[PDB]
Amino acid sequence: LSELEKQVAGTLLKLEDTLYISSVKEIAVDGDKKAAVVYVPYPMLQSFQKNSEALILKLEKNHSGHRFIIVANRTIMKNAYVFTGKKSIRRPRSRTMTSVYNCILDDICYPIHVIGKRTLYPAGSNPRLQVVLPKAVYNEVSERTKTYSAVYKALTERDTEFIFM
RNA sequence: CCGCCGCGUGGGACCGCGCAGCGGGCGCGGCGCGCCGCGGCAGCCCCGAGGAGAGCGGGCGGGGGCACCGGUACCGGCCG
């Protein structure tokens, strides 16, 4: 129920010639360009994953002004066990914070599979994570690394940066 | 202030244990035993230790057990 959703829905209705979205989030970047994150419901992420590179390209080409990213919305629970007083309810591991952040990171760059992760602990600077991408693909993704860092920082307060190795 | 392996409040890093869905309606103030939509949930498996065990393939070796079998030599006997 906001302007962006109206035109993106119209777009989607134009593209076919069955799948719907949950919400849309827009995150700012240092440059005037912004990012739009589309929250896909979990059961159909794979439905929006097969041919989604074309989908994002067409969406960007229709309404310019900021890049489009597709991610799923996952829930995080804050207790390993829940004590109802009589028995105990165990939290599934899929609902942890560490798993969710890793899945988000994979989803942000879904077409390109992450090759490694490292976190550095400088003497004074806040610890930061740096990930490693395939050396084959670069110029395709070189121009969208600041946006990736910004969106990852927004969703998860953890900061990061990108390189190729 | 000083004879406490017990009692209460707090913290909860470290050390060890938690198999048996949830939420709403019937339903009484609350809790149970039950009856109901699944119509509300992302319903319900960390990874796979230069730990271990099991498996396939490859060659390696005076490793083990059973039967079988050759060769001089020591000894004894016999022909010359």
Side-chain angles (χ1 to χ4, degrees), chain A residues 56-71:
Chain A
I56 307 328
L57 169 43
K58 300 215 296 187
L59 209 48
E60 193 41 302
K61 183 204 57 32
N62 185 172
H63 175 255
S64 56
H66 34 261
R67 305 145 217 271
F68 286 72
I69 291 294
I70 288 183
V71 309

Side-chain angles (χ1 to χ4, degrees), chain A residues 58-117:
Chain A
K58 300 215 296 187
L59 209 48
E60 193 41 302
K61 183 204 57 32
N62 185 172
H63 175 255
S64 56
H66 34 261
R67 305 145 217 271
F68 286 72
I69 291 294
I70 288 183
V71 309
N73 47 353
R74 306 156 163 98
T75 173
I76 295 177
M77 300 171 43
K78 72 170 320 193
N79 262 311
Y81 283 79
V82 175
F83 194 52
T84 181
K86 277 61 57 165
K87 53 154 50 53
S88 306
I89 324 295
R90 167 133 197 70
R91 175 184 59 194
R93 276 268 199 159
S94 40
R95 308 290 199 286
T96 45
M97 188 183 42
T98 81
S99 292
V100 165
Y101 289 178
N102 303 3
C103 297
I104 289 172
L105 182 58
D106 230 17
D107 256 3
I108 290 179
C109 49
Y110 59 97
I112 315 115
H113 275 0
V114 159
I115 307 291
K117 309 190 207 175

Side-chain angles (χ1 to χ4, degrees), chain A residues 13-154:
Chain A
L13 297 149
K14 309 299 143 308
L15 309 177
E16 46 273 65
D17 209 6
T18 326
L19 285 293
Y20 187 69
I21 72 180
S22 78
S23 298
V24 187
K25 186 59 211 97
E26 175 134 41
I27 288 89
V29 190
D30 56 59
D32 266 13
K33 260 277 192 72
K34 334 169 62 181
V37 190
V38 177
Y39 290 118
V40 157
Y42 198 68
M44 34 179 83
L45 179 68
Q46 324 201 10
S47 299
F48 315 81
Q49 215 145 42
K50 277 158 295 331
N51 292 334
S52 64
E53 233 59 52
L55 191 133
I56 307 328
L57 169 43
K58 300 215 296 187
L59 209 48
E60 193 41 302
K61 183 204 57 32
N62 185 172
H63 175 255
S64 56
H66 34 261
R67 305 145 217 271
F68 286 72
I69 291 294
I70 288 183
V71 309
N73 47 353
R74 306 156 163 98
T75 173
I76 295 177
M77 300 171 43
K78 72 170 320 193
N79 262 311
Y81 283 79
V82 175
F83 194 52
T84 181
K86 277 61 57 165
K87 53 154 50 53
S88 306
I89 324 295
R90 167 133 197 70
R91 175 184 59 194
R93 276 268 199 159
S94 40
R95 308 290 199 286
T96 45
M97 188 183 42
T98 81
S99 292
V100 165
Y101 289 178
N102 303 3
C103 297
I104 289 172
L105 182 58
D106 230 17
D107 256 3
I108 290 179
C109 49
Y110 59 97
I112 315 115
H113 275 0
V114 159
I115 307 291
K117 309 190 207 175
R118 315 203 252 251
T119 149
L120 331 174
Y121 285 79
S125 155
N126 216 271
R128 60 158 189 295
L129 156 138
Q130 73 145 310
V131 333
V132 191
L133 288 183
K135 190 52 52 55
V137 288
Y138 178 97
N139 40 58
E140 325 68 36
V141 207
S142 54
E143 79 290 42
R144 44 207 289 99
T145 46
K146 271 65 57 199
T147 165
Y148 285 176
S149 301
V151 297
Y152 207 57
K153 157 66 66 47

